Amino acid sequence: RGSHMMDRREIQRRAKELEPWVNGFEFEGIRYAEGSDHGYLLSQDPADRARAFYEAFPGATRILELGALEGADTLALARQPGTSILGLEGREENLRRAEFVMEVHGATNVELRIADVETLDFATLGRFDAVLCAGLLYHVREPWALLKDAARVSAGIYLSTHYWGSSDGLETLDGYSVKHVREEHPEPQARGLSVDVRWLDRASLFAALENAGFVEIEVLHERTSAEVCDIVVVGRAR
Numbered sequence: 207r208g209s210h211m212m213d214r215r216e217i218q219r220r221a222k223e224l225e226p227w228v229n230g231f232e233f234e235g236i237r238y239a240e241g242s243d244h245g246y247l248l249s250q251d252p253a254d255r256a257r258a259f260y261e262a263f264p265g266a267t268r269i270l271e272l273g274a275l276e277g278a279d280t281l282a283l284a285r286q287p288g289t290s291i292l293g294l295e296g297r298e299e300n301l302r303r304a305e306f307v308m309e310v311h312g313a314t315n316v317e318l319r320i321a322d323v324e325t326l327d328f329a330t331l332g333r334f335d336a337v338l339c340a341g342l343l344y345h346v347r348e349p350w351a352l353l354k355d356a357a358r359v360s361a362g363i364y365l366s367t368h369y370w371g372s373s374d375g376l377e378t379l380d381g382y383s384v385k386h387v388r389e390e391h392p393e394p395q396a397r398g399l400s401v402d403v404r405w406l407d408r409a410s411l412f413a414a415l416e417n418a419g420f421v422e423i424e425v426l427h428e429r430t431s432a433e434v435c436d437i438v439v440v441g442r443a444r
């Protein structure tokens with residue numbers, strides 16, 4: 207066992223101490239921890255997401271990831287030589303798992319930081335070639351503001367989000383049509399940091415992207431229903 211490797215005993219001990227995991231943890235063919243009942247609602251193919259991300263942003267060498275959870279997408283993005291990733295995560299318990307993942311895998315081109323995207327001054331972060339914003343936009347109170355924050359630091363966003371499939375009866379805030387609800391996402395460790403969230407209807411999601419500066423929007427995937435809809439878009443700004 208190479209001197210750079212964490213002992214399997216320590217991998218096991220720390221993985222167990224870090225339970226409960228959301229997406230589980232396996233290394234060297236050993237399943238140390240299982241994920242949650244609703245982990246299926248989150249990224250389960252980080253390698254495929256990273257491929258799609260780098261198809262969209264082939265030149266990217268400095269990437270910002272928002273809502274890094276247990277570091278699965280962070281690690282997949284970091285496999286590339288010549289890239290550096292900053293992953294922001296709002297829940298300390300999740301961040302500790304992501305930090306463990308990076309240590310086990312020796313992923314030295316990753317930095318992870320605790321941060322609340324609703325209050326962070328994004329102008330302190332520097333510039334990024336692109337922002338990964340997956341599974342997060344429906345966990346904040348003012349989603350349009352998170353998109354503006356991405357545009358403050360980058361000209362590219364890979365956005366995976368839900369939106370609400372109807373406009374009738376929605377509230378209005380900053381001119382956007384919003385479904386304002388208590389934060390009750392089925393996965394407790396995926397929840398936002400406010401008591402409430404606002405979902406957008408489709409028109410308001412696209413307006414919010416445009417108003418942030420992401421004026422070219424490519425739809426990679428969309429699933430529509432009357433209520434919860436899913437979309438993956440690449441937004442590009444001037």
Ligand SMILES: Nc1ncnc2c1ncn2[C@@H]1O[C@H](CSCC[C@H](N)C(=O)O)[C@@H](O)[C@H]1O
Pocket residue numbers: 248249272273274275276279294295296297300321322323324340341342345346395396397398399
């Ligand atoms: N205000 C906030 N600031 C920072 N992280 C937040 C946040 N609100 C929610 N999060 C984090 O964002 C993640 C949402 S779940 C999505 C995880 C991952 N991006 C994926 O696509 O599968 C969780 O790790 C959650 O703790």
